[PDB]
Design an enzyme around this catalytic site. Structure first.
Site, PDB file in Angstrom:
ATOM      1  N   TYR A 128       7.948 -90.936   6.050  1.00 27.12           N
ATOM      2  CA  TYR A 128       7.707 -90.866   4.598  1.00 27.12           C
ATOM      3  C   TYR A 128       7.336 -89.262   4.148  1.00 27.12           C
ATOM      4  CZ  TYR A 128       6.430 -95.716   4.842  1.00 27.12           C
ATOM      5  OH  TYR A 128       6.795 -96.947   5.026  1.00 27.12           O
ATOM      6  N   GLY A 172       9.384 -86.756   2.611  1.00 23.91           N
ATOM      7  CA  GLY A 172      10.588 -86.807   2.226  1.00 23.91           C
ATOM      8  C   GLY A 172      10.855 -87.860   1.365  1.00 23.91           C
ATOM      9  N   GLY A 195      11.077 -90.266  -0.625  1.00 23.78           N
ATOM     10  CA  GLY A 195      10.331 -91.704  -0.483  1.00 23.78           C
ATOM     11  C   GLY A 195      10.157 -91.709   0.795  1.00 23.78           C
ATOM     12  N   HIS A 226       0.404 -90.539  -0.167  1.00 17.24           N
ATOM     13  CA  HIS A 226       0.444 -89.773  -1.523  1.00 17.24           C
ATOM     14  C   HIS A 226       1.622 -90.335  -2.190  1.00 17.24           C
ATOM     15  CE1 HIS A 226       2.672 -86.546  -3.663  1.00 17.24           C
ATOM     16  NE2 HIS A 226       1.562 -86.259  -3.840  1.00 17.24           N
ATOM     17  N   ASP A 227       2.831 -91.142  -1.487  1.00 20.20           N
ATOM     18  CA  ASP A 227       3.958 -91.942  -2.307  1.00 20.20           C
ATOM     19  C   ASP A 227       3.054 -93.112  -2.919  1.00 20.20           C
ATOM     20  OD1 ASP A 227       5.493 -90.381  -0.784  1.00 20.20           O
ATOM     21  OD2 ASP A 227       6.663 -92.061   0.146  1.00 20.20           O
ATOM     22  N   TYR A 281       1.152 -91.698  -5.961  1.00 22.20           N
ATOM     23  CA  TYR A 281       2.305 -91.542  -7.031  1.00 22.20           C
ATOM     24  C   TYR A 281       2.808 -93.019  -7.681  1.00 22.20           C
ATOM     25  CZ  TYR A 281       3.066 -86.616  -6.995  1.00 22.20           C
ATOM     26  OH  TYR A 281       2.668 -85.124  -7.274  1.00 22.20           O
ATOM     27  N   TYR A 305      -0.390 -79.840 -14.139  1.00 23.64           N
ATOM     28  CA  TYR A 305      -1.795 -80.080 -14.172  1.00 23.64           C
ATOM     29  C   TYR A 305      -2.407 -78.850 -14.084  1.00 23.64           C
ATOM     30  CZ  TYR A 305      -0.864 -80.869  -9.265  1.00 23.64           C
ATOM     31  OH  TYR A 305      -0.266 -80.401  -7.745  1.00 23.64           O
ATOM     32  N   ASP A 322      -2.332 -85.146  -5.154  1.00 21.94           N
ATOM     33  CA  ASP A 322      -1.630 -83.960  -4.562  1.00 21.94           C
ATOM     34  C   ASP A 322      -2.938 -83.295  -3.584  1.00 21.94           C
ATOM     35  OD1 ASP A 322       0.738 -82.526  -6.922  1.00 21.94           O
ATOM     36  OD2 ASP A 322       0.828 -84.452  -5.588  1.00 21.94           O
TER      37      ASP A 322
END
Ligand SMILES: CCCCCCCCCCCCCCCCCCOC[C@@H](O)COP(=O)(O)OCC[N+](C)(C)C
Ligand SMILES: [Ca+2]
Ligand SMILES: [Ca+2]
Ligand code: NA
Lengths: 124, 124
Positions: free
Chosen positions: B28, B30, B32, B48-49, B52, B73, B99
């Site tokens: 993961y 990388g 997707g 994190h994917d 997102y 941000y 993040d």
């Protein structure tokens, strides 16, 4: 490898912030890359994308199954001058050369602030 | 945006080379990913994917049409501590926290160098 390409853009362009400057620029700097590129710099990225496609099509790269950003190579920098080491075997050399070519290209093309972070859905 | 994610990793992990280190690790960390995460650090990336994906579907990000890596941000680094500025608007704040959560998770999880640069078609 991507971290090496990052290294190369710093080598060719002294105080650069490569991810903050070039990722998500125009229609082609970043992932994806679709449409008419918006300037010379964008064209650098579109050429880079074509180079990696050609890498994947290269017989010398038949055993690389992941994408060329995962292929490490050997390279050096000397006073802003990037060097792809002769020690590289065929695929590594070819991918090294793609990144070098785009690294130089970025340095010579004008940077157009207004092309940063476009709405790609609208304009690409 | 992606450069700020990099900078957050540098923050949480002062020894870091984030692309070199965490790009192209496991299934993961990388482009997707898919498959079973190979270890805790790899689960940091799956999370994190997912975050997102959540951002992409969050009403407050409804005007964010590109990928969350393109969203700017405000964040600050100080003593290994990451702060997502309380001034952030809701979408900005959400992604900043995705993040921040990830860098933190990366700072806690073991790094297992046999998990770097996996053949993802074969093992993911
Ligand atoms: C800073 C160090 C941390 C390491 C992170 C480095 C990686 C960042 C990469 C930067 C370049 C951008 C790469 C990000 C790509 C991840 C992108 C991964 O997202 C996968 C999905 O969005 C793809 O799904 P589809 O778009 O096919 O969904 C189809 C939906 N319908 C409409 C067909 C139903
Ligand atoms: Ca592209
Ligand atoms: Ca991923
Ligand atoms: Na970025």
């Amino acid at each position: 490898a991507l971290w090496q390409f990052r290294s190369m853009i710093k080598c060719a362009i002294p105080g650069s912030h490569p991810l903050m400057d070039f990722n998500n620029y125009g229609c082609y700097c970043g992932l994806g890359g679709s449409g008419t590129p918006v300037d010379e710099l964008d064209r650098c990225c579109e050429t880079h994308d074509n180079c990696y496609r050609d890498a994947k099509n290269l017989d010398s790269c038949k055993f690389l199954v992941d994408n060329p950003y995962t292929e490490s190579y050997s390279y050096s920098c000397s006073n802003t001058e990037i060097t792809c080491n002769s020690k590289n075997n065929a695929c590594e050399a070819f991918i090294c050369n793609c990144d070098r070519n785009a690294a130089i290209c970025f340095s010579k093309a004008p940077y157009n602030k207004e092309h940063k972070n476009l709405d790609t859905k609208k304009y690409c």
